[PDB]
Design an enzyme around this catalytic site. Structure first.
Site, short mmCIF file in Angstrom:
data_model
loop_
_atom_site.label_atom_id
_atom_site.label_comp_id
_atom_site.label_asym_id
_atom_site.label_seq_id
_atom_site.Cartn_x
_atom_site.Cartn_y
_atom_site.Cartn_z
N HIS A 133 23.18 25.55 -20.49
CA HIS A 133 24.04 26.22 -19.86
C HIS A 133 24.61 25.47 -18.67
CE1 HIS A 133 23.89 29.70 -22.47
NE2 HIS A 133 22.85 30.13 -21.81
N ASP A 171 19.81 27.12 -30.38
CA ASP A 171 19.64 28.43 -29.60
C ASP A 171 20.61 29.59 -29.60
OD1 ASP A 171 20.23 29.84 -26.56
OD2 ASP A 171 18.23 28.76 -26.58
O1 LIG Z 1 18.65 32.69 -22.40
C1 LIG Z 1 19.29 31.95 -22.02
C2 LIG Z 1 19.21 30.49 -21.90
S1 LIG Z 1 18.90 29.71 -23.44
N1 LIG Z 1 20.57 32.28 -21.58
C3 LIG Z 1 20.86 33.85 -21.60
C4 LIG Z 1 21.30 34.35 -20.24
C5 LIG Z 1 21.15 35.76 -19.83
C6 LIG Z 1 21.90 36.10 -18.47
C7 LIG Z 1 22.11 37.72 -18.58
N2 LIG Z 1 20.95 38.49 -19.31
C8 LIG Z 1 21.10 38.87 -20.82
C9 LIG Z 1 20.08 39.52 -21.14
C10 LIG Z 1 19.18 39.75 -20.01
C11 LIG Z 1 17.95 39.96 -19.79
C12 LIG Z 1 17.37 39.95 -18.50
CL1 LIG Z 1 15.79 40.64 -18.36
C13 LIG Z 1 18.09 39.24 -17.60
CL2 LIG Z 1 17.38 39.06 -16.09
C14 LIG Z 1 19.33 38.65 -17.68
C15 LIG Z 1 19.64 38.78 -18.91
K LIG Z 2 23.54 27.37 -29.46
ZN LIG Z 3 19.32 31.06 -25.19
#
Ligand SMILES: O=C(CS)NCCCCCn1ccc2cc(Cl)c(Cl)cc21
Ligand SMILES: [K+]
Ligand SMILES: [Zn+2]
Ligand SMILES: [K+]
Length: 355
Positions: A133, A171
């Site tokens: 990201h 991912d």
């Molecule tokens: O995973 C990755 C990198 S591969 N990118 C996803 C980013 C998520 C940001 C917003 N978002 C969505 C579900 C969720 C759950 C929690 Cl607990 C928190 Cl803190 C933020 C969340």
């Molecule tokens: K992806």
């Molecule tokens: Zn992810």
């Protein structure tokens, strides 16, 4: 050893001092590493040492302002750390975050060098924080620097500028940073499978839709496979690989394959909601191994069920070592077929293997 492995427990020091239950936990990488130990996979791998990326190496993809801002967090006070975090979309920072991000990228540079100089055939990188990201100028979605994008540029810097690099991002989230960094580039082919929900899923933009095919010389070299309305799993991902990912990848003829290997599309992940099995990830890895003379680097991205990511990433390393793909146990969801056919139509003008 045919397969390299890099892991440094220092990358566990990045942590959330306010929400200790934030899903991007330090023990993500130690649980994966411990699973490699008990499956006797670590003893079969060549241990590649971690290192810090240099600031000049971070400049291969990132602006000097973004690099300076993140570097400043090293000695910033907790209040300053907090106010810096909320400047970005879903980012937490500690005094150890900048060094852990350097270690993540530097680990992948050392692994790419080991692959490209013939020390190993392929490699796995158990690293955190994730990177896909991260934009040229900003952090986002738990990512500070785009480890995969930096590794592709580093790879070109030690071979030739026009080295054809394939980045496969499986991912569950779209690698927005990776797409934008290479969007005008035909030397790096970016293919992403991601839950999309018509733009209602992080990072919540239409840049991840199938109609974004690249720009300029890069037209045709950005492939977005967006999933809508359905909990996708092994059938949908195998179908996308058969009809899109592998046909395009074979025609691109990469000389290096980087996998943004998040495991948040795995069965059991609290964020992804999909049901890709560990054996499914094994089959995806097995197929990419047929490319680029086997020169494949698997870089950990997301994935937040500790048991799911440990079994899933260990399956991929098992495939990298040459073990036979395990057997796969559903007809494809209609919206998945609709997605695959929308991508085919978007990219047919650019790839003869699609027509
Ligand atoms: O995973 C990755 C990198 S591969 N990118 C996803 C980013 C998520 C940001 C917003 N978002 C969505 C579900 C969720 C759950 C929690 Cl607990 C928190 Cl803190 C933020 C969340
Ligand atoms: K992806
Ligand atoms: Zn992810
Ligand atoms: K591209």
């Amino acid at each position: 050893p045919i397969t390299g492995l890099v892991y440094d427990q220092r990358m566990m020091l990045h942590h959330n001092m306010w929400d200790s239950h934030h899903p991007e936990l330090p023990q993500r990488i130690s649980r994966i590493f411990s699973r490699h130990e008990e499956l006797r996979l670590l003893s079969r791998c060549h241990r590649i040492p971690a290192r810090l990326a240099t600031e000049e190496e971070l400049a291969l993809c990132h602006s000097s302002k973004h690099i300076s801002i993140i570097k400043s967090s090293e000695h910033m006070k907790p209040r300053d750390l907090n106010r810096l975090g909320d400047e970005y979309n879903s980012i937490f920072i500690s005094n150890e975050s900048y060094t852990c991000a350097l270690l993540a990228a530097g680990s992948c540079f050392n692994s790419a060098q080991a692959i490209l100089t013939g020390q190993v055939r392929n490699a796995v990188a158990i690293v955190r924080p994730p990177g896909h990201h991260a934009e040229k100028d900003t952090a986002c979605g738990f990512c500070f620097f785009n480890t995969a994008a930096l590794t592709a540029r580093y790879a070109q810097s030690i071979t030739r500028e026009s080295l054809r690099v394939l980045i496969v991002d499986w991912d569950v989230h779209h690698g927005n940073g990776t797409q934008h960094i290479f969007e005008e580039d035909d030397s790096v082919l970016y293919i992403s499978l991601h839950r999309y929900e018509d733009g209602a899923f992080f990072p919540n933009s239409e840049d991840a839709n199938y109609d974004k095919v690249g720009l300029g010389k890069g037209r045709g070299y950005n492939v977005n496979i967006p999933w809508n309305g359905g909990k996708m799993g092994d059938p949908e991902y195998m179908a996308a690989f058969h009809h899109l990912v592998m046909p395009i990848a074979r025609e691109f003829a990469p000389e290096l394959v980087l996998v943004s290997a998040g495991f948040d599309a795995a069965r059991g992940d609290p964020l992804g909601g999909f049901q890709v099995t560990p054996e499914g990830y094994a089959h995806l890895t097995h197929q990419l191994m047929s490319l680029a003379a086997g020169r494949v680097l698997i870089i950990l991205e997301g994935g937040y069920n500790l048991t799911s990511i440990s079994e899933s990433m260990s399956m991929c390393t098992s495939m990298l070592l040459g073990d036979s793909p395990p057997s796969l146990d559903t007809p494809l969801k209609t919206s998945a077929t609709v997605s695959i056919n929308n991508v085919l139509r978007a990219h047919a003008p650019f790839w003869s293997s699609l027509r």
